[PDB]
Enzyme design. Structure first.
Site, PDB file in Angstrom:
ATOM      1  CG  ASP A   1       5.801  -3.860   2.296  1.00 57.06           C
ATOM      2  OD1 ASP A   1       5.468  -4.926   2.784  1.00 57.06           O
ATOM      3  OD2 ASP A   1       6.791  -3.280   2.695  1.00 57.06           O
TER       4      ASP A   1
ATOM      5  CE1 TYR B   1     -10.583   2.503   0.990  1.00 57.93           C
ATOM      6  CE2 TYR B   1     -12.651   3.204  -0.100  1.00 57.93           C
ATOM      7  CZ  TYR B   1     -11.308   2.921  -0.119  1.00 57.93           C
ATOM      8  OH  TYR B   1     -10.585   3.099  -1.261  1.00 57.93           O
TER       9      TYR B   1
ATOM     10  CG  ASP C   1      -8.672   1.938  -3.431  1.00 54.60           C
ATOM     11  OD1 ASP C   1      -8.037   2.965  -3.233  1.00 54.60           O
ATOM     12  OD2 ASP C   1      -9.547   1.896  -4.261  1.00 54.60           O
TER      13      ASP C   1
ATOM     14  CE  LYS D   1       3.809  -2.823   6.284  1.00 54.93           C
ATOM     15  NZ  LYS D   1       5.087  -3.279   5.741  1.00 54.93           N
TER      16      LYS D   1
HETATM   17 MG   LIG Z   1      -9.780   2.475  -6.382  1.00 53.99          MG
HETATM   18 MG   LIG Z   2       8.177  -1.758   3.136  1.00 55.59          MG
END
Ligand SMILES: [Mg+2]
Ligand SMILES: [Mg+2]
Lengths: 414, 414
Positions: free
Chosen positions: A281, A158, A305, A228
């Site tokens: 995830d 960002y 986000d 992640k």
């Molecule tokens: Mg957003």
């Molecule tokens: Mg995955």
């Protein structure tokens, strides 16, 4: 210089960490573009009703209109989307609230919402999402969601460090990577755009510190770091390890034995806050499958986000989701939806989001009772099934109210 | 060299784009670590039953065990997690299927699943998610989801180009950025990890081309490009514009007027496929709120990671979600869940995922009838409420079956 600062009214003061709020403070507001013109009147109205009702005339907010986005070009000239005094004023008067913002394409201008956050160093994006009883939800058990997102606002991808494919700059950093850094990992080095993702140790620690503190102060059950890091070891993985280390070093974190999770004892309530992490995830799955397991959430910018958007949709609040961007020197409360230009001026969209951002602001000023009256009003109007078009489409038995009327329906239920 | 290649059996051939599959092909399989030892036996069994049943003895698969992960170190020595012949063999025999893989921490080893994809250049991660009638779902209307994810596998932040905070390398690229590139945008340049996100034009166009083609071939309704291009203009924004351009240039795309969406006429069915895009965080909301609007999805690596996980959780299939990694020279079908070490050997986990990856593989070989028999069997067993522990916890009236028994329950319903 085009801002008319209220004749009556007095500046909020920051007397070393603590806000000193007067009984008549000046609050800057940016109306917002699009439906900003519909929802910001409804918010001024229910907030004035809520501090009138709560303090029986003793307090009043002096609203001061300041400009950004499209309205700013209609006020200061076609080319100024972000007045430099908007940033001085938000910083001077300490709290502000904004409606949706249009950022133009075709002019090389970076997202105005993000720009405010970065320019003012408001490093905490605070998004509370909980279910309001009676709102239509796509899930069977939205009542199970009661989470608070601490999203890092100042670094990650960002930050806006990127170069165009076939540009000379891109040609240059790709040359530096392959030749000077020996990177043999770019599948197609020609016609390739490049983005930079930074994650520092002060950047994640000032955020996580804010989240654990929130957790002690509101004696919430846990803080989940989501990341992640198994793929991005040195940014997202670093984030998780700096977060555990801070819980260990500053909050007296101890292994819930065997590891990796930690226990922080709330010095106030005596309870134990579990500090834990989960891969992002899998987290997207866990919020839908086991929402009651999660409470305070700390994460980087892109993850934050995504998480808050997905969670606001599952509780049926994509139009009533509150937001704050908090730094050490000022705070900016905001509508979290877009400008919805097709509906602007029709007085039809949901004022819900910016009104609940206004309650977060009130709560932040220490004007707790006014803030309690708004979530009282809101619960009341939603339960009355006295609602705006976006909720009525999905409800059987509801009365359809305009934007301004939904405002009055909140004041009736106070 | 520790792989015993079947005495009976014959190599699948790639005779210029088209697979030439013999009636007795050799298929490499990697058992997988953890519960790989439970689910891979069930899959060999229901696939052998399904091609026995479909072709009445005319065809048989010659299975050839190959090694990666933890099993590979027990076969070739403590230090080899990825045998170099695993990669030659997958490439030689053209299709393979794998169970879950453990990647070690403490040894500087990058994710073995990702490594296979990159090493073999399998640039399409193909994840179909649809609802199987009767599986427990957290959402009211999981039947509305019938989507196919085309996730880009070879570039984005997954490429693994990153440097540690306070490392000399990181110190060097950050110096290059600030001094040679003039970047004034890293909030905290000290103690900062750096990740690189590449997005090339050949990389997104080979993926999007595969997705639109899939859409023509299975005459699906639309292709949605999802991206966060308003923030990351030169990687994710580039992705979306190269995708529209390819639909315009190669597939005769035309503006659904005014733009930005395009119409592609399927040369076979005559219908029109809408090519459209949506910002990724709004997409996370749209899949939950309006799933029937979306069909084929094309996106970059990290987005594709998140999207498929969230969608598999909403249809109640986090343990029965199929996956393929397809390149131009070979394809690798896989269980999409992890190794679940606490349950390994108990014969209890759901074989569902790897079995539906086996049907994708069968379908890919052109052995369509065997593949139809498996989704027939699966529907049958789920509807019979003859199910494994993970589905039974959430169902009233279900019969609890072990992993191997759920295999037999699929063969009964064929
Ligand atoms: Mg957003
Ligand atoms: Mg995955």
């Amino acid at each position: 210089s085009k801002v008319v600062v209220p004749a009556q009214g007095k500046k909020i003061t920051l007397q070393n960490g603590k806000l000193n709020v007067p009984e008549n403070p000046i609050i800057p507001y940016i109306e917002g573009d699009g439906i900003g013109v519909d929802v910001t009147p409804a918010m001024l109205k229910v907030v004035d009703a809520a501090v009138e009702k709560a303090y029986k005339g003793e307090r009043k907010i002096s609203w001061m209109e300041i400009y950004t986005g499209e309205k700013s070009t209609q006020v200061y000239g076609q080319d100024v989307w972000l007045p430099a005094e908007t940033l001085d004023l938000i910083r001077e008067y300490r709290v502000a609230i904004k409606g949706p913002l249009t950022t133009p394409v075709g002019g090389g201008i970076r997202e105005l919402n993000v720009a405010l956050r970065q320019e003012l160093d408001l490093y905490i994006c605070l998004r509370p999402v909980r279910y309001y009883q009676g709102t239509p939800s796509p899930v069977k058990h939205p009542e199970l969601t009661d989470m608070v997102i601490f999203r890092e606002n100042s670094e990650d991808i960002y930050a806006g460090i990127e170069w165009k494919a076939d540009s000379a700059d891109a040609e240059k950093v790709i040359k530096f990577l392959r030749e000077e850094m020996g990177v043999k990992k770019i599948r197609f080095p020609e016609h390739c755009g490049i983005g930079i993702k930074p994650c520092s140790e002060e950047g994640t620690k000032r955020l996580v510190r804010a989240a654990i503190e929130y957790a002690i102060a509101n004696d919430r059950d846990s803080v989940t770091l989501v990341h992640k890091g198994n793929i991005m070891k040195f940014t997202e993985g670093a984030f998780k390890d700096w977060g555990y280390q801070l819980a260990r070093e500053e909050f007296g974190g101890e292994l819930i034995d065997g590891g990796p999770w930690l226990k922080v004892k709330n010095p106030n309530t005596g309870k134990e806050i579990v500090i834990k992490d989960v891969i992002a995830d899998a987290f997207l799955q866990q919020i839908l499958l086991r929402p009651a397991e999660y409470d305070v959430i700390a994460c980087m910018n892109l993850n934050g986000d995504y998480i808050s958007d997905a969670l606001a949709a599952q509780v049926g609040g994509i139009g009533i989701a509150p937001g704050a961007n908090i730094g050490d020197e000022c705070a900016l409360f905001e509508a979290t939806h877009g400008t919805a230009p097709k509906y602007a001026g029709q007085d039809k969209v949901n004022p819900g989001s910016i009104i609940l951002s206004a309650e977060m602001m009130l709560r932040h000023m220490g004007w707790t009772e006014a803030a309690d009256l708004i979530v009282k009003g809101m619960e009341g109007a939603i339960n009355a099934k006295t609602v705006t078009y976006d909720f009525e489409r999905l409800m059987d038995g509801a009365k359809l109210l305009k934007c301004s009327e939904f405002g009055d329906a909140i004041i009736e239920n106070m």
